[PDB]
Design an enzyme around this catalytic site. Structure first.
Site, short mmCIF file in Angstrom:
data_model
loop_
_atom_site.label_atom_id
_atom_site.label_comp_id
_atom_site.label_asym_id
_atom_site.label_seq_id
_atom_site.Cartn_x
_atom_site.Cartn_y
_atom_site.Cartn_z
N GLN A 36 -16.53 -3.34 3.96
CA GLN A 36 -17.18 -4.48 3.34
C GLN A 36 -18.54 -4.75 3.96
OE1 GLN A 36 -14.05 -6.98 5.63
NE2 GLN A 36 -15.24 -8.52 4.49
N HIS A 174 -8.91 -14.26 6.91
CA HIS A 174 -9.15 -12.86 6.55
C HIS A 174 -8.07 -12.33 5.63
CE1 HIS A 174 -11.08 -9.05 6.96
NE2 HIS A 174 -10.15 -8.48 7.70
N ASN A 204 -7.36 -2.36 7.03
CA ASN A 204 -8.49 -3.28 7.07
C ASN A 204 -9.60 -2.83 6.13
OD1 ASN A 204 -10.06 -5.42 7.87
ND2 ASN A 204 -9.75 -5.02 10.06
#
Length: 241
Positions: A36, A174, A204
């Site tokens: 990201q 998150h 992740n």
């Protein structure tokens, strides 16, 4: 946005399962981890990722979808400034599919208008269920990877390998995805012999150069009730069937 037990039955039934481990990664259920970058899009990456897996599993197809199209078009969220998993799936349905990672590349925080026309093959989801704060491993085992939330502490970022069980963050800050669990059997830095350390396997969105190839292992118990850092407090898994 559905009744779990109602669906868990359509997939499990009376089949018993190993609570120590199941890893969607090595059964063709986890598309590659992404990055990201410096944009606060975890939510888009998490939801997209769980969608990618449903295809990789159910429709046995590998397809990577545009997180950027979500950051640009999911209005129930705030692009680089944050969002909510279910909102994402919501907007996914509203938009009737998302363009491929390929026809609508990610560009993180760089301003960028929303163009739903950047492609012709939109991959969507029929709907999305919310999985119970417990019965996680169960969902994980038959439904597939799950988009979840967690409180990430500063040291969570330093995690380089192993079974993180360090300090957690303030509140849910998150979105990552659960892709499975496992259990390494260690010895005992505290005088004896054997012992079992169970863990969840997180995917992740900080690129491969992070943790174990982008994945991290979080402590837990055989039962899969020990949710460090708030694991799956918010937990959803989209359905494309």
């Amino acid at each position: 946005q559905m009744n779990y037990e109602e669906v868990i039955k359509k997939y499990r039934g009376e089949e018993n399962f190993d609570h120590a481990a199941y890893d969607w990664r090595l059964h063709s259920g986890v598309t590659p981890v992404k990055d990201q970058k410096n944009c606060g899009s975890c939510w888009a990456f998490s939801s997209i990722g769980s969608v990618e897996s449903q295809y990789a599993i159910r429709k046995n197809k590998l397809i990577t979808l545009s997180e950027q199209e979500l950051v640009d078009c999911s209005f129930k969220n705030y692009g680089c400034n944050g969002g909510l998993i279910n909102n994402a799936f919501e907007d996914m349905i509203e938009l009737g599919g998302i363009c491929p990672d390929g026809d609508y590349p990610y560009v993180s925080d760089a301003p960028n208008l929303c163009n739903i026309d950047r492609c012709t093959e939109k991959y969507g989801i029929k709907n999305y269920l919310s999985v119970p704060d417990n019965k996680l491993k169960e969902a994980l085992r038959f439904l597939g990877p799950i988009s979840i939330s967690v409180a990430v502490s500063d040291d969570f970022a330093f995690y380089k390998e192993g079974i993180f069980d360090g300090e957690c963050g303030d509140q849910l800050n998150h979105a990552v995805m659960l892709v499975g669990f496992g259990m390494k059997e260690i010895v005992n830095p505290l005088t004896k012999k054997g012992e079992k350390h169970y863990y969840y396997i997180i995917k992740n969105s900080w690129g491969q150069q992070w943790g174990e190839r982008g994945f991290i292992n979080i402590e837990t118990d055989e039962s899969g009730l020990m949710r460090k850092c708030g694991l799956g407090t918010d937990a959803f898994i989209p359905l494309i069937e």
